[PDB]
Design an enzyme around this catalytic site. Structure first.
Site, PDB file in Angstrom:
ATOM      1  N   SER A   1     -11.104   3.309  -6.519  1.00 13.33           N
ATOM      2  CA  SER A   1      -9.822   2.184  -6.387  1.00 13.33           C
ATOM      3  C   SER A   1      -9.460   0.946  -7.174  1.00 13.33           C
ATOM      4  O   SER A   1      -9.818   0.984  -8.149  1.00 13.33           O
ATOM      5  CB  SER A   1      -9.514   2.372  -4.472  1.00 13.33           C
ATOM      6  OG  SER A   1      -8.422   2.407  -4.173  1.00 13.33           O
TER       7      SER A   1
ATOM      8  N   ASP B   1      -3.580  12.675  -5.784  1.00 16.38           N
ATOM      9  CA  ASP B   1      -3.400  11.281  -5.767  1.00 16.38           C
ATOM     10  C   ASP B   1      -2.192  10.737  -5.707  1.00 16.38           C
ATOM     11  O   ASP B   1      -2.289  10.917  -6.331  1.00 16.38           O
ATOM     12  CB  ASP B   1      -4.300  10.328  -6.658  1.00 16.38           C
ATOM     13  CG  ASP B   1      -4.580   8.898  -6.160  1.00 16.38           C
ATOM     14  OD1 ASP B   1      -4.341   8.976  -5.540  1.00 16.38           O
ATOM     15  OD2 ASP B   1      -5.652   8.763  -6.746  1.00 16.38           O
TER      16      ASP B   1
ATOM     17  N   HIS C   1      -7.441  11.227  -2.908  1.00 15.74           N
ATOM     18  CA  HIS C   1      -7.657   9.534  -3.518  1.00 15.74           C
ATOM     19  C   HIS C   1      -8.982   9.038  -2.831  1.00 15.74           C
ATOM     20  O   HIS C   1      -9.425   8.898  -3.565  1.00 15.74           O
ATOM     21  CB  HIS C   1      -6.876   8.584  -2.822  1.00 15.74           C
ATOM     22  CG  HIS C   1      -7.249   6.945  -3.643  1.00 15.74           C
ATOM     23  ND1 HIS C   1      -6.964   6.451  -4.692  1.00 15.74           N
ATOM     24  CD2 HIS C   1      -7.673   5.846  -2.981  1.00 15.74           C
ATOM     25  CE1 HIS C   1      -7.379   6.011  -5.254  1.00 15.74           C
ATOM     26  NE2 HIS C   1      -7.355   5.132  -4.109  1.00 15.74           N
TER      27      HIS C   1
END
Length: 262
Positions: A129, A175, A207
Site C-alpha cells: 500500500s 482494490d 486491498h
C-alpha cells in the site's frame, strides 16, 4: 557458474511451499534504531552455501510488521535475509516510508547482528500500500537495488520512468483503496520500456490480499527475488513464459518483459 545460487533446483512444489529448503531464525530490531521503527529479521541459519541477499518489507498506512509477518519465514526459508520493518509512526506517508526502507537497508547491511550473512551488494525492497509507494521511492533513489516489489501500491506520484530497478507490481483486481486504474497500472505503464518488469493483477482480490498468506504472491515474489537478487536463471522457469489470465486463473491480468537476461 552463478556464485549466488542457493538451494536445490526449484519445482512448483518448492516455490509454492510454506517453507523452502533453509531453516530460519529471527533477530528483533528495537524502535531505538535511527531512521525507522525497528522490525524482525528472518534469516537462514545455514551459512555453508555463502551469504544471502537482503530484503526490507514496509507495511501500509495504520499498519505495522504484523500485516507482512507471514512473508518473513516464507521468503527467508528460500535463501533470503528478510527485514519486516515498522515505521516511526503508523500515519507516515509514502515518501517517508521510502526513506525508512533506505535506513533499514543501511541498518541491515551495516549494523544488524546478521550483517555478516547479508551480501550488501544484492538488496531488494517490497512494501504494502503506502509501503508499496515507499518501495518505488526507494527503488527510484537507489538504482543499485537488484529488485523492487510494490504490493497494491499507493502513491500520489504516478510517474516512475526514472526507476532503474527490476520492478514487479502486484495489484488487486477489486482494490477500492489503491485502485489499479489510478495506482498500480499508471505506475507500471510509466516504467522504462527497457526495464525488466511485471504487472500481476490478482483475480477478484481486495486491498488486504498482501496481508493474508497467499501462494500466488509468495511464488512470484520468491521467483522475482531469486531471478534478480541472486541472478538465478533457474527461477526464470516460474516468470517466463507469462501465465494465462482467463477468468478462473489467479490473474485478471499479467504483463511481462520475457525473457529476462541479467
Amino acid at each position: 557458474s552463478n556464485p549466488y545460487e542457493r538451494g536445490p533446483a526449484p519445482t512448483e512444489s518448492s516455490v509454492t511451499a510454506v517453507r523452502g529448503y533453509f531453516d530460519t531464525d529471527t533477530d528483533t530490531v528495537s524502535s531505538l534504531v535511527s531512521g525507522f521503527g525497528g522490525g524482525t529479521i528472518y534469516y537462514p541459519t545455514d551459512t555453508s552455501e555463502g551469504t544471502f541477499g537482503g530484503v526490507v518489507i514496509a507495511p501500509g498506512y495504520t499498519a505495522s510488521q504484523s500485516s507482512m509477518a507471514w512473508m518473513g519465514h516464507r521468503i527467508a526459508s528460500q535463501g533470503f535475509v528478510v527485514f519486516t520493518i515498522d515505521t516511526i509512526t503508523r500515519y507516515d506517508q509514502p515518501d517517508s516510508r521510502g526513506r525508512q526502507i533506505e535506513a533499514a537497508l543501511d541498518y541491515l547491511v551495516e549494523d544488524s547482528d546478521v550483517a555478516d550473512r547479508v551480501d550488501g551488494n544484492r538488496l531488494a525492497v517490497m512494501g504494502h500500500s503506502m509501503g508499496g509507494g515507499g518501495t518505488l521511492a526507494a527503488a527510484e533513489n537507489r538504482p543499485e537495488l537488484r529488485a523492487a516489489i510494490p504490493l497494491t501500491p499507493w502513491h500520489l506520484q504516478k510517474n516512475w520512468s526514472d526507476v532503474e530497478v527490476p520492478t514487479m507490481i502486484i495489484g488487486a483486481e477489486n482494490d477500492t483503496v489503491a485502485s489499479v486504474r489510478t495506482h498500480s497500472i499508471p505506475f507500471y505503464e510509466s516504467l522504462d520500456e527497457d526495464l525488466e518488469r511485471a504487472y500481476l493483477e490478482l483475480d477478484g482480490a481486495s486491498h488486504f490480499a498482501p496481508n493474508i498468506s497467499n501462494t500466488v504472491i509468495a511464488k512470484y515474489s520468491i521467483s522475482w527475488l531469486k531471478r534478480f537478487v541472486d541472478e538465478d536463471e533457474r527461477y526464470e522457469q516460474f516468470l517466463c513464459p507469462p501465465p494465462d489470465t482467463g477468468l478462473f486463473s489467479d490473474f485478471s491480468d499479467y504483463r511481462d518483459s520475457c525473457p529476462h537476461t541479467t
